[PDB]
């Protein structure tokens, strides 16, 4: 009967706990018939500890890179290539060098001698407190999203879950595998530049504080001599 996707509300932070709390009742309720998939648009990175303390969170996708961290005896130095991570070298008595490379989120190689680590993790900062499912919806399944821990309700108007497209999920989904940046997002502090559009055109100012990843500028224009503070998109003032 064709089943849909679904995006469902989950206590941010806890999106990979409610996944496997879902997972378990469509178990234990008997309905893993309905769903096809359960996921976590986020990226996959991998997190180095030394001593219980987070020293590193970089994506698992990228060329070959070495890092090294201080740890309780001495430095482990962990690899990431080809989109697998491993230990390269430890302080002597750390197996962990043995260890085979790790892949996949969840999973992760620790260093019992010097006390370091490195996991690898879905992180999701960009869709924050959700996750998605393809199913097909029905009572029993809907009772079963709302008693799992970390979830609470799938979106909905008018009291019906929102199905979302397949080709729209994919090409986000796809989109969020290979994040990269594009490049640096550039527009430093005191830059002169000319607005180009809007109730400020031709105004000129200077960029007085820059928002990356927010493209949003806080620029000082003079108006009656007074240096007013207003805030323009990237595409809304040109640099000169």
Avoid at 141 to 166: D, N, Q, S, W, Y
Wanted: one cysteine or more; glycine letters at 8%.
């Amino acid at each position: 009967l064709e089943k849909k996707w679904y995006a469902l509300q989950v206590e941010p932070g806890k999106e990979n706990e409610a996944k496997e709390n879902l997972l378990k009742v469509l178990e234990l309720e008997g309905l893993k018939d309905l769903v096809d998939e359960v996921i976590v648009p986020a990226e996959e990175k991998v997190v180095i500890r030394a001593q219980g303390k987070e020293k590193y969170r970089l994506s698992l996708k990228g060329n070959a890179r070495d890092i090294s961290v201080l740890g309780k005896k001495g430095v482990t130095t962990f690899r990431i290539e080809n989109g697998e991570v491993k230990v390269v070298e430890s302080v002597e008595g750390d197996t962990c060098v043995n260890a085979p490379p790790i892949s996949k989120p969840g999973q992760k190689i620790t260093c019992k001698e010097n006390k370091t680590e490195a996991k690898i993790v879905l992180d999701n900062k960009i869709f924050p407190g959700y996750i998605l499912i393809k199913a097909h919806m029905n009572d029993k399944l809907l009772m079963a999203i709302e008693k799992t821990p970390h979830v609470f309700r799938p979106v909905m108007v008018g009291g019906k879950p929102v199905p979302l497209k397949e080709e729209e999920v994919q090409n986000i989904l796809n989109q969020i595998k290979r994040g990269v940046k594009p490049s640096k997002v550039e527009f430093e502090k005191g830059d002169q530049v000319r607005v180009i559009e809007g109730p400020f055109m031709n105004f000129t100012g200077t960029v007085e504080e820059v928002h990356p990843e927010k493209r949003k500028l806080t620029v000082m224009i003079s108006i009656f001599g007074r240096m007013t503070p207003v805030e323009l998109d990237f595409d809304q003032v040109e640099k000169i």
